[PDB]
Amino acid sequence: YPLSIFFIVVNEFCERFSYYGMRAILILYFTNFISWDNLSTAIYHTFVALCYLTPILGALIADSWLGKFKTIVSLSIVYTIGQAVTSVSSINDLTDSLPVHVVLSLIGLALIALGTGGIKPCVSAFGGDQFEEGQEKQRNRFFSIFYLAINAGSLLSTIITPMLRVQQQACYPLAFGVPAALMAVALIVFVLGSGMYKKFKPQGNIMGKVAKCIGFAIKNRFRHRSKAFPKREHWLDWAKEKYDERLISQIKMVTRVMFLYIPLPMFWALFDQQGSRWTLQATTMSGKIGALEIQPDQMQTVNAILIVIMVPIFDAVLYPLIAKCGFNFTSLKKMAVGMVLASMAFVVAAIVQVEIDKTLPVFPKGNEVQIKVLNIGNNTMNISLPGEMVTLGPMSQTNAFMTFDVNKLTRINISSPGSPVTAVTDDFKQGQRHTLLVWAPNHYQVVKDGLNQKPEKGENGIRFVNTFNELITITMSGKVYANISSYNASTYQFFPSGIKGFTISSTEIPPQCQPNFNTFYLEFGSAYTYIVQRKNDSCPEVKVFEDISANTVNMALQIPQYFLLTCGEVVFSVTGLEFSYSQAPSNMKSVLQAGWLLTVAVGNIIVLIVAGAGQFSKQWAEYILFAALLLVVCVIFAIMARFYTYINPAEIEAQFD
């Protein structure tokens, strides 16, 4: 048997790597039409439907018309041809009949749409078929190894993909060639193993027979409106009138198994919510391990890193250990446990989020308006605010922003010891942090900050304030602040972590002065304001003040929730697909796998429909999103599964004819 399984494993590995490393370049290239076209949105939304519908259109072809082997071969051939046509056409579109080549490229995309889906159920069913005579242990081993191989391909695509771009903007030839070459290699290596495989062909158009039988049965059931109309069994009482009992039993088994999958799409949609939330939580969790400098958005790879190790470990040790203590640990129990663990992952996440909430600042809401005062003069200033008065020495700042309401922010007065009083005439906008600058009794400035949230991706924001008489221009690590007027401040520009250097340029500064300066270690999530001041010899000098404190909590704290989520995903998915194959009848192994994939498709549709989030508070959002939905789904699924859906040994039940 191993000779018949190694080829399948390598083919799956290569195909998955190709698809994952191909999708990103696909979207990058199709962005040409997305922008060139809101007409493009309609096309995309109907196109994704083809990708979500191809699985059934492949399974139906495989089981009834051509068989699994022929379907795999043909679908792989067309998929490779699609990649090849996309690769060749993309060259003309970027070098140069342009609409013709664009149409050929779109036809290639459509062809790939078929291939991406046509292989998923058929290959799994073909792999499962190879085991016989009570080798269920080896079958489970194979299924676990197959699931591991899929994630290994995904991880390799994730790690390799970044190297590709702009390695040669016209690097598309390699981009669309390498996946095609790898898919061709996979197809050839799979085909060369034909001699050892085991294959079957259908007796006929089973799907058409099933459709006709179902129609006749439901019509007959709707007959006899006043003669034993209540069913003894929904189809045994009526379909039996004309059709063979074997087909009746097969459809009965398929319907019975499929009944269990009704709740699963909701679970999938709920589970998918973590992707766009935990990354942001990482953004606000930019604390760093002392050893290395992982970026906030790189945490997502931990899922694959954990799965590719968890999958072997369970089958290797855990299940034998659970069996030794005699727990009789069956499939339905495994799936329920997996979903429960998935639920617990989110409660751990909620605990971490509420722990984080301690050290974040508070930003204005609604009509609230916030102000920070910064004295940049040579002397002390006294400033009167609504219901408060503050004294600031030279080159000094208020520790934190003062919060007021737009209606109540009516009077502001500035004065210095023995100096005249100046009233503020500027206007403050609601929901915006404002910086107030004072350097003299009758000289001040109001600056809109713009920053009302933690910087995206944990980057550090920097801005400069000019105190020189003439304009100044600042360049720092590939970015430039140009033409800053006297006693004015520029907008924030975001930079990644690490130390950075910058140069100061201005006509007022004599050329012989020191041009360059360096900043301290910026860490993550922080924002700082720099003030440039004139020395005795006209040289510039730099001083720093803080605006938002650097982030505190270490980023390693996300590991527990990710570990729980990965365990729940594995122990659920592997057992789910194994059970799906196990209970399917002989004539329809592929259809039920296609139904399993449709289960994920429907969850994807549900998550897309719900779309943007609107929960009032993150702590409650992370909390309910399991405590009120996931456990309810789990209890519903357990109640449904309580009715002996596992009673059927599909392999031998049909022997009674």
Author numbering: 12 to 48, 50 to 108, 117 to 188, 195 to 683
Sentences from the paper on this structure:
PepT1 belongs to the solute carrier family 15 (SLC15), also known as the proton-coupled oligopeptide transporter (POT) family, which consists of four members in eukaryotes: PepT1 (SLC15A1), PepT2 (SLC15A2), PhT1 (SLC15A4), and PhT2 (SLC15A3). PepT1 and PepT2 are best characterized and mediate the uptake, distribution, and resorption of di- and tripeptides in the body. On a structural level, human PepT1 (HsPepT1) is 708 and human PepT2 (HsPepT2) is 729 amino acids long. Both polypeptides consist of a core transporter unit of predicted 12 transmembrane helices (TMs) of the major facilitator superfamily (MFS) fold and an extracellular immunoglobulin-like domain (ECD) placed between TM9 and TM10.
In the outward open state of apo HsPepT1, the central substrate binding cavity of the transporter unit is widely exposed to solute molecules from the extracellular space with an opening of approximately 30 Å. So far, among the available POT structures, no outward-facing conformation has been observed. In HsPepT1, the large bending of TM2 is stabilized by a hydrogen bond between Y64 (TM2) and N630 (TM11) in the extracellular region of the transporter unit. The sealing of the cytosolic side is stabilized by two interbundle salt bridges between R159 (TM5)–E604 (TM10) and R161 (TM5)–D341 (TM8). (A) In the first step of the transport cycle, the transporter is in an outward-facing open state stabilized by two salt bridges between R159-E604 and R161-D341. Concerning the HsPepT1 structure, 11 residues at the N terminus, four loops connecting TM1-TM2 (residue 49), TM3-TM4 (residues 109 to 116), TM5-TM6 (residues 189 to 194), and TM11-TM12 (residues 638 to 641), and the last 25 residues at the C terminus could not be modeled because of poor density likely caused by intrinsic dynamics and partial disorder.
